[PDB]
Paper text:
To gain structural insights into the specificity of the RGS7-Gβ5 interaction, we solved the 2.13 Å crystal structure of the RGS7-Gβ5 dimer complex which required buffer optimization using thermofluor. The structure contains all domains common to the R7 RGS family members: DEP-DHEX, GGL and RGS. The core of the molecule is formed by the Gβ5 subunit, which has a typical β-propeller fold commonly found in domains with WD40 repeats. Notably, Gβ5 is engulfed by all RGS7 domains, making extensive contacts at four main interfaces: the DEP domain, the DHEX-GGL linker, the Gγ-like (GGL) domain, and the RGS domain. In RGS7, the DHEX domain is lifted upward and away from Gβ5 thereby creating a wider groove between DHEX and Gβ5 when compared to RGS9. Together, this distinct organization of the Eα1Eα2 and Dα1Dα2 loops positions them close to the invariant Eα3Eα4 loop to assemble a strong cluster of basic residues on the surface of the DEP-DHEX interface. In RGS7, the DHEX-GGL linker forms a 310-helix embedded into the β-propeller ring at the hotspot region of Gβ5. The present structure shows a unique mode of Gβ5 integration into the complex providing the first example of Gβγ like complexes in which N-terminal α-helices of both Gβ subunit and GGL are protruding away from β-propeller fold of Gβ subunit.
RGS proteins act as GTPase-activating proteins (GAPs) by interacting directly with activated Gα and accelerating GTP hydrolysis thereby promoting G-protein inactivation upon reassembly of the inactive Gαβγ heterotrimer. RGS7 is a prototypic member of the family, broadly expressed in the nervous system and periphery and involved in regulation of multiple GPCR systems with key roles in physiology.
Numbering used by the authors:
A (entry chain D): 2 to 353
B (entry chain A): 18 to 218, 252 to 450
Write the structure that this text describes.
């Protein structure tokens, strides 16, 4: 007409500018998606028959085993359970070396210090505490407890950095946090997850100040430990992300979920590149970890079993039976010679 | 809820098992004493899963079927312990009313009515299992004040079961028993109902402005072709296959298979093996990961009078390993030794990294030298590291 403010004439200009950038990204993502990983991996020769068996059985915990972590010496193992007890084993001989009882139940997280002289653990106490390890006679570990982290909900995962002086923590209050062990100071908080954070894994490149985490919002997020910001996020699972683990090169990571699938995301491709699943696998995956070369992905499921996946070709190369309840934690040895699974059946098993 | 997701998947399987054309045949067999209606054998379940789910290993199919039984979708008619056997044991489907997905967290007051009703059956001559009788004794002690009304409630249910179709009564009695075999399992059996403690819980002008900045940030990300990404993953993994103990047997043996720890002592020796030295050549990260590779890398650079870049990088990495109490004084020591004008081990940064670091030192922190370390790392990756790999020192280690 001759009047009219015509706000929509400029809103349509902004809508045609936001639509074009979105279509620009959709067309670029499709242009880069020229092949599938398993199609390229047809060039690779298939793996031979596997004969992995249980080599050690760690019996001692009084309730569900909830977490475990290898020591850098390739044989010692820290493990935590629902009854509140944390145990340090010499898994090669199965001898218990250290043990501490915590003031809470459901100690869902434990970790081994890079020096091998301390451990961190926590759970329903909404904290993460560092305990020293000594060769002391009648050693009283609880009297040396260092309270480091502190959240408003349960602790779901923890991990030392490249030294004994900092720990990462993931909590059910939707946050990850970096802490100074000596002082208990909060170095950085990581806000972004829309629900409980269930897991985390530090970047393999000790030069890299990044880590990945997974939560009940079906998302996996890569963080910058300097800025505290989420620099990359992935959402393709149909349920909770229970475990995340970096591919050995650091350019990719895998995840296990309650949707009975394991997926591989590549940070350079900025998309999920592989899905590890099968019609007969309907229980959720609780933990995942890679072999040394990254060719194999080990996963522990709530069906009491362990499924080993060819990371490149996608096919399942083994299924391992033994546990009589859920497999709650699974980690490959620091030298890749074995892997250890912890279960709700109160035991841990070392396989090779 | 995540616990519901596996129920729907199990219930989908039960839906396929009950198909008319390609389902499990449900028969009414007879024994020497009685006739048993609407049953099927365990081998029928195992062979159905093998065929219709394409499971090659029968142990895997038997294991999948044993978890469906434990969760209460089919049950053995002759055992309170819910499991599956690959033989002629007779099983019976659970009615969808007693399914675990049907909002079931039954109370002890409901179990007391059930156990009380059971002792009335068979002209009050039914004998509960030992664990059931011990459960009833605890419930009678707990609900001792209101026991007259639990008895009346169970006596009222028994009158309905008495005037009930004999064949339907036989099937429903076992189905109600199988329901309580899930929620009050036999001692020693996994309680499938136990759950993880984690899981037991403006104008439209600024809106378009929020979108445009969102999508533009996504376009700024540098991505790679899937062909290039797949090529780098395939070549990186193939590089370490000879080092993967799950794929190639370790020298001399895997300590977990042979109980011989000589492999661990060789890996920790200060004299490296040829494969260990060869691994340093895969990239600078491998040389820096290996403590012997780090020593030999540094030892070479000091012999060529060019170690300042690596010693600075090693100093910053140690800085991020220090407690936050020590980092302000340590930042000044790194600045004085490597970056300040007239420094003993002066490194050469670009003007952008040097200006940023000069301002970062004014307020020290753990990441004061990140922009500089990033630059020095790429510099060694293209200069100092190729010099080490090409040195006669490395070549004499690589050839033993």
């Amino acid at each position: 007409a001759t009047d009219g403010l015509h706000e929509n004439e400029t809103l349509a200009s902004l809508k045609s500018e936001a639509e074009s950038l979105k279509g620009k990204l959709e067309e670029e993502r499709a242009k880069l998606h020229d092949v599938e990983l398993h199609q390229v991996a047809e060039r690779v020769e298939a793996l031979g028959q596997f004969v992995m068996k249980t080599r050690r059985t760690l019996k001692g915990h009084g309730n569900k085993v909830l977490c475990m972590d290898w020591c850098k010496d390739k044989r010692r193992i820290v493990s935590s359970s629902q009854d509140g007890k944390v145990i340090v084993w010499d898994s090669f001989t199965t001898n218990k070396e250290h043990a501490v009882t915590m003031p809470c139940t459901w100690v869902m997280a434990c970790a081994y210090a890079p020096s091998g002289c301390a451990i961190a653990c926590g759970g329903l106490d909404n904290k993460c505490s560092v305990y020293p390890l000594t060769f002391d006679k009648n050693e009283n570990m609880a009297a040396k407890k260092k309270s480091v982290a502190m959240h408003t909900n349960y602790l779901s995962a923890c991990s030392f950095t490249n030294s004994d002086m900092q720990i990462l923590t993931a909590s059910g209050d939707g946050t990850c946090a970096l802490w100074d062990v000596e002082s208990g100071q909060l170095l950085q908080s990581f806000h972004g997850h829309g629900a409980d954070v269930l897991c985390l894994d530090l970047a393999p490149s000790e030069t890299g100040n990044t880590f990945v985490s997974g939560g009940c919002d079906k998302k996996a997020m890569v963080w910058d430990m300097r800025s505290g910001q989420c620099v990359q996020a992935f959402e393709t699972h149909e349920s909770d992300v229970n475990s995340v683990r970096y591919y050995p090169s650091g350019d990719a990571f895998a995840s296990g979920s309650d949707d009975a699938t394991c997926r591989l995301y590549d940070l350079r491709a900025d998309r999920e590149v592989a899905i590890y699943s099968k019609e007969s696998i309907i229980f959720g995956a609780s933990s995942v970890d890679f072999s040394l070369s990254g060719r194999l992905l080990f996963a522990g499921y709530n069906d009491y079993t362990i499924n080993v996946w060819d990371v490149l070709k996608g096919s399942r190369v083994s299924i391992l039976f033994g546990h009589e309840n859920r497999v709650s934690t699974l980690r490959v040895s620091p030298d890749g010679t074995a892997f250890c699974s912890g279960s709700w059946d109160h035991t841990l098993r070392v396989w090779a | 809820s995540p616990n519901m997701l596996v129920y729907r998947k199990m219930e989908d399987v039960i839906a396929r098992m009950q198909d008319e054309k390609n389902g499990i045949p449900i028969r009414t067999v007879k024994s020497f004493l009685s006739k048993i209606p609407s049953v099927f054998s365990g081998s029928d379940i195992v062979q159905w899963l093998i065929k219709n789910l394409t499971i090659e290993d029968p142990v895997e199919a038997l294991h999948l079927g044993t978890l469906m039984a434990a969760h209460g979708y089919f049950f053995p008619i002759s055992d309170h312990v819910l499991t599956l056997k690959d033989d002629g044991t007779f099983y019976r489907f659970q009615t969808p009313y007693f399914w675990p997905s049907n909002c079931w967290e039954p109370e002890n007051t409901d179990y007391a009515v059930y156990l009380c009703k059971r002792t009335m059956q068979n002209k009050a001559r039914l004998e509960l299992a030992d664990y059931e009788a011990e459960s009833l004794a605890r419930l009678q002690r707990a609900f001792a004040r209101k026991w007259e009304f639990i008895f009346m409630q169970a006596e009222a249910q028994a009158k309905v079961d008495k005037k009930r179709d004999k064949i339907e009564r036989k099937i429903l009695d076992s189905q109600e028993r199988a329901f309580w075999d899930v929620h009050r399992p036999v001692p020693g059996c996994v309680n499938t109902t136990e759950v993880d403690i984690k899981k037991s819980s403006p104008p439209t002008e600024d809106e378009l402005q929020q979108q445009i900045k969102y999508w533009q940030i996504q376009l700024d990300r540098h991505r790679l072709k899937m062909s290039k990404v797949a090529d780098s993953l395939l070549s990186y993994t193939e590089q370490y296959v000879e080092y993967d103990p799950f794929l190639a047997p370790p020298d001399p043996s895997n300590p977990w298979l042979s109980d011989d720890t000589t492999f661990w002592e060789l890996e920790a020796s200060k004299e490296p093996s040829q494969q260990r030295v060869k691994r340093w050549g895969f990239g600078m990260d491998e040389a820096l990961k290996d403590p012997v590779g780090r020593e030999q890398f540094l030892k070479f650079l000091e012999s060529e009078f060019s170690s300042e870049n690596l010693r600075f990088w090693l100093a910053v990495e140690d800085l991020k390993k220090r407690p936050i109490r020590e980092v302000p004084s340590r930042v000044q020591e790194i600045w004085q030794e490597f970056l300040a004008p007239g420094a003993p081990s002066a490194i050469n940064l670009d003007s952008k990294s040097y200006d940023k670091t000069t301002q970062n030192v004014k307020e020290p922190g753990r990441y004061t030298f990140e922009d500089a370390q990033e630059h020095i790392y790429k510099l060694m990756k293209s200069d100092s590291y190729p010099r080490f790999i090409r040195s006669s020192a490395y070549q004499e280690l690589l050839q033993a």
